[PDB]
Design a protein around this ligand. Structure first.
Ligand SMILES: C/C(=N\Nc1nc2ccccc2s1)c1ccc(-c2cccc(S(=O)(=O)NC(=O)CCCCCc3ccccc3)c2)o1
Length: 144
């Protein structure tokens, strides 16, 4: 999808803005999915992410690191399969890897992390999203 590409892009830009970094590595129901996912991600970071294993601990992200490394770590969010919260967490996770990377002046890694997210979302998560009524059902379940 291209739709999903802009979600990842929307999410990462919001998060970089929010946490105080440049988001300029990045140059209706869709504004509505964006919002719902934005807020979802904030609620997950606020209330919940504290409980989980730091998956950022299990991926010292560096210029050498490739998609399989990424994939293998995100796979830990989905050993029991996909659900909406785990998808929210997946976006959280990416945002996190963007904050660390800019915090590590590797600002260029960002767009690549966004590449990986769009690949991972599209290869593994999409089959579930569609089965479960797509993003419009997420919004209905997590709006406001
Ligand atoms: C380890 C991990 N995440 N780690 C992360 N690290 C970072 C760092 C930065 C940003 C995001 C993350 S996410 C992980 C695995 C699964 C999930 C997850 C994410 C979102 C939602 C959910 S959830 O909604 O599906 N909830 C759970 O999985 C917990 C439910 C536990 C029920 C246990 C139970 C047993 C028997 C009877 C009743 C209940 C899981 O996170």
């Amino acid at each position: 999808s291209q739709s999903n590409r802009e979600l990842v892009v929307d999410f990462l830009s919001y998060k970089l803005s929010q946490k105080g970094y440049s988001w300029s590595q990045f140059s209706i129901p869709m504004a509505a999915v964006k919002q719902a996912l934005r807020e979802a991600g904030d609620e997950f970071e606020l209330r919940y992410r504290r409980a989980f294993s730091d998956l950022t601990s299990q991926l010292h992200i560096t210029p050498g690191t490739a998609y399989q490394s990424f994939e293998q770590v995100v796979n830990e969010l989905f050993r029991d399969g996909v659900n909406w919260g785990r998808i929210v967490a997946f976006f959280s996770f990416g945002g996190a890897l963007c904050v660390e990377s800019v915090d590590k002046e590797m600002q260029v890694l960002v767009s690549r992390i966004a590449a990986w997210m769009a690949t991972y979302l599209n290869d593994h998560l999409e089959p579930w999203i569609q089965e479960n009524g797509g993003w419009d059902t997420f919004v209905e379940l997590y709006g406001n």
